[PDB]
Symmetry: D2
């Protein structure tokens, strides 16, 4: 009755998934998932990390992980370029899929995966972990309850500086063919996942983009950076409401600055992921005490009580992934819907690729 887990990849997100699967029942109860197969290359690395992560075995063969009869669900955290192949193989093998963002490098690959998921009758979720913080889920509930009235404006950014150093070498990830989008693919899609959760679907974008560092060192020479370092867009939501949107991988001093704000007719909500335990809420008050409230994360907020009964004991980035694992567990058990599945994920892919198209063509793109 325990869920059988396969994990492909052991990097930033691979180890994050491994830590989540290990403690999901500790936090939320029920049966601890069985950690069956860890796939990674080379073989000696898969064997070492399988042992320390507590997987029953490691293998250099990713298809072993998706085909084992003892596996019910596959975490896929490999580079963007093999997401489509591995996800479709896992669905064809009758496995549920936890796929790291983005879905694939192109809308066309994401469309094929979306059709494959519908055909499989298996649960899918995409790894948009910034939608899982108690603060973010609390903000969505406050908007649903009318805490800020009708939303009238969204302003969101996602700034990091991991590519700011012009000496960082060229890679496949910086080509259109093998890397897909740049900052829009790495960061933009995260901001879309948060933005559409707050404001509903996107109807129109008008975008601009820049490549700040256009060429990088490559094996004693240099190679051209083909995707964007930063992008900005004006949004019209299906509601008719306005939005401002940006992302950057060259914004010096920022490490995880996914920051957003919803302005409403009766209040304002504001958040910055670099301080993920604070949610700022303004509602009209009598003039003597009027001002924004600092809501510090605690057991009043979704998910937090599963990890800690004491408010102000800071919730961590990695615990977002434990919440994500639990949402997929509950969906597989038919006790909840996981968001976003491959259908809702395809919509997010269309928005970021539409922003890329808009920036290139100088035309607004409608959805």
């Amino acid at each position: 009755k325990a869920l059988g887990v396969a994990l492909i990849g052991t990097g930033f997100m691979g180890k994050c998934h491994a830590m989540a699967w290990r403690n999901v029942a500790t936090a939320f109860g029920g049966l601890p998932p069985r950690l069956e197969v860890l796939a990674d290359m080379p073989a000696d690395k898969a064997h070492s990390l399988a042992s320390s992560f507590g997987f029953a075995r490691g293998t250099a063969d990713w298809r072993e992980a998706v085909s084992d009869p003892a596996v019910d669900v596959v975490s896929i955290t490999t580079p963007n370029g093999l997401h489509r192949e591995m996800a479709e193989a896992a669905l064809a093998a009758g496995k549920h899929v936890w796929l790291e963002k983005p879905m694939a490098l192109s809308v066309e690959d994401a469309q094929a995966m979306e059709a494959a998921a519908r055909a499989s009758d298996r649960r899918t979720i995409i790894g948009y972990n910034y939608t899982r913080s108690p603060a973010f889920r609390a903000a969505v509930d406050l908007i649903a309850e009318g805490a800020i009235g009708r939303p009238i404006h969204f302003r969101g950014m996602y700034d990091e500086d991991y590519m700011a150093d012009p000496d960082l070498p060229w890679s496949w990830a910086l080509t259109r063919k093998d890397g897909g989008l740049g900052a829009l693919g790495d960061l933009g899609c995260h901001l879309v996942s948060v933005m559409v959760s707050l404001m509903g679907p996107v109807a129109r974008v008008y975008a601009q983009a820049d490549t700040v560092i256009t060429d990088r060192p490559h094996q004693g020479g240099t190679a051209r950076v083909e995707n964007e370092d930063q992008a900005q867009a004006l949004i019209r939501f299906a509601s008719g409401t306005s939005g401002e949107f940006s992302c950057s991988r060259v914004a010096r001093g920022y490490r995880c600055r996914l920051a957003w704000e919803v302005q409403g007719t009766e209040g304002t909500l504001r958040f910055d992921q670099e301080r993920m335990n604070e949610l700022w809420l303004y509602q009209p008050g009598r003039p003597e005490i009027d001002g924004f409230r600092r809501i510090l994360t605690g057991p009043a907020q979704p998910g937090f009580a599963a990890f800690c009964p004491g408010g102000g004991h800071n919730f961590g980035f990695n615990e977002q992934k434990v919440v994500e694992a639990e949402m997929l567990r509950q969906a597989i058990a038919g006790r909840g819907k996981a968001w976003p599945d491959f259908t809702d994920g395809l919509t997010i892919e269309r928005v970021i690729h539409g922003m890329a198209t808009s920036a290139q063509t100088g035309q607004p793109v409608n959805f």
Copy 2:
């Protein structure tokens, strides 16, 4: 040789200008300006406020005030619809002009005022006071010294909520003919004054705008709000750099949130007017101590030492206006160039009206 001052209006900016003229020599030295004539309506209020503001006389006739031979410079702090008439009369009478923003209701009006100012050979400055804080002036100098390398992105906002209450009555300020622009005219022009001082001139805008409260109480019933409560724009600068721009008069909880950020190849500068004594600077550092610095306003920043020798003694909004007065004083004496004059101001008017045009047409607007 002391400057003779006429002040028209005694409200938010009228009292701000009066306080600035009274302490400009206290802060910066030289001779205190002579406070000659205060013009306001009705007469009884002009007489009352001339006495408490320390002007030699009050009048209900602004035309007599700008024509007084004892007057050298005119502060104009009246409503937007009166700027063109009063500025043109002041320049025609051979007076230097300190004009509140925005210049007028239309680009056509601003163009006529710009021509009148050049024809007069008198100094002009527009009341873009957010360019006068020690933090802002320190940021411009840091960019000039290459402290953040080459600017690659600007993001700016100016949020206030003074029109957020839907019960606030309709006024002539909310008509296009008598009010001109909405949030772009009240707040947007301030953000442009700061943005172009940091990033240089605007080449292109693509904008969106909304009226979120479309009808307000008027007499027994309601009247239509014709101008925007909020606007946002993507910017392309003449330098080729990108920008994000917004303003709002309905952003709940914000009172004076003119906030901006310049991202460069070698650092980032960030500022919020609601904490006008803090400038955030990131420059790459060794990993053990890497992070943004909180630069607290003190005497190392332009203008501050004229007000206080001790750092961290917070500089105030009103003291921006004393700095503005000193810059006009020095321009009149021929010891400095005042920014923005009516020529520089006209460019700012074209940008905010260009953003309004872009929002109306759904098309980008180019300036160069």
Copy 3:
């Protein structure tokens, strides 16, 4: 009819007082005080600053300024060792007195000044300007209204780093005989003025102190620093409530960090002078929205509306002094009581000297 003003000193506080006297009627109405006599040394400095500050004349003789028949009130902004002589002379000459903190070098000095003020029947106020911010005055009113219930704890600090550099030269301010207390005299008295305004009178202190830099450069040689660089104290108020208290002139990175909080049975108030426009208020709320409010200074808070009708337009350090001037004008006109007068100031002197005594002897000190 207008108040005649003498100003002694033109430094940090001298120029602050001059700017306050120049705009007090601009802000609060009535007749602008007449700036009659400025005293400073040397004479040509007094003449130059009298001209730029708008005083009718300058003199190198402080006794000339306090004795002038056109003078009704004297601002005394000279070094601490001169306060007693100048305040007693001004009171003897029948002048009201605006005296900078601390009162003098000793409790004995303050007792003599307190007696002289009662005998003179003139108004006195001491320049505890941190009690004048809209945020501070709002906090006092909130406590009185029961906004935080029953106060149960005070914690206050006043950190600055103006003496943190060991190569900063020795001065006569660093002897006990000529300079009095160290950080307790420069900063401690400010924190006491705020603390007793929130919590009421002090009943008992137990204090510790240190001199961190005991020797400083003196004319190519070295000389001994005799007074404390930092001090900390536990407080019992007359109410029986507990307090924590500290001050430091060597706390690196702090410029004006007068910060306090009052914890109560139904809320908490917290403040930091380096962000003097923010007051933090916690009151119990429904769990979904529970948290501290950031109250941004605006016209709802005492004094602010006299300077600006727009909330979030930051009130400045110097404008605290315009409020202080207005409180003295109103006390002179018999329309308000100024705090603290020399009687209430003597109590503050007893508290800071009791803390110094406690730190010296390792024993608690009790008051009235």
Copy 4:
């Protein structure tokens, strides 16, 4: 692999269980074997052993600490049970991870400290605020001379879990069954951080108050006997000054363990409610002079074991994974665990000395 017994399943019980489950995931080596979980009643012990992934649940903690498959015992039970359970675990030849404070009295802590030395087993006490990357980074910066010589410490630990007068009385508010109040709940945490930054305490002078003196009990009222808040002036063995406070009645504060070290060449400042930020001032040229916001990332001790990217906030619970790893390494003879029962007993003497100073109105020397 290490065999683990866990006693208790509450706030710290679940925290320890999550730590033992991911310590090898984060730091490598063999995952500890989760052998026995002890809790009452037996149905709760069985259901939580199942969800926590322990091989068996028992309502008898004594046979859990005696199990031959157990090498180390996590003790997360109420304060009054610490002495009995730690002494039994040491006597059975087990390593001990004990929650703070050690016990209700110095007498009890003295007995536990002797038992730990008499055994050749490792001990560590759950002072988990010493485990954050920001805190460990601050200790390293001080040792490296980044702020020169410490000249002042100011620390507080404010929470409001007892601030509401409506909150009912409990046995924890008696001296006999509860021991100390705010000093025992929060004060000992602040001491663990303070002595790690400044070195040992030489002297305290303290004040304490019970500000809500009676609470609802069985439709009547019962007396609160221990302190709601306490403050102390400190002298360290170094001669340096300190300020210290704790409170369980400080409205609006949830986990406000906040401290500051002022030095001859800079200042370090930290607030646990923003546990991923360390504020460092060092003198700079006037145009750029100011405090640096150091955001937690892989440059700080422990962080890289959890995440390769800076600014991905480290959490309260991950402090406990670091604590587990330090105990693992100490059991393997590859590091000393701090604080053991000897170093823990010093902390107990400091908080009990503060309580005595407040009661007698006299300084207490150590």
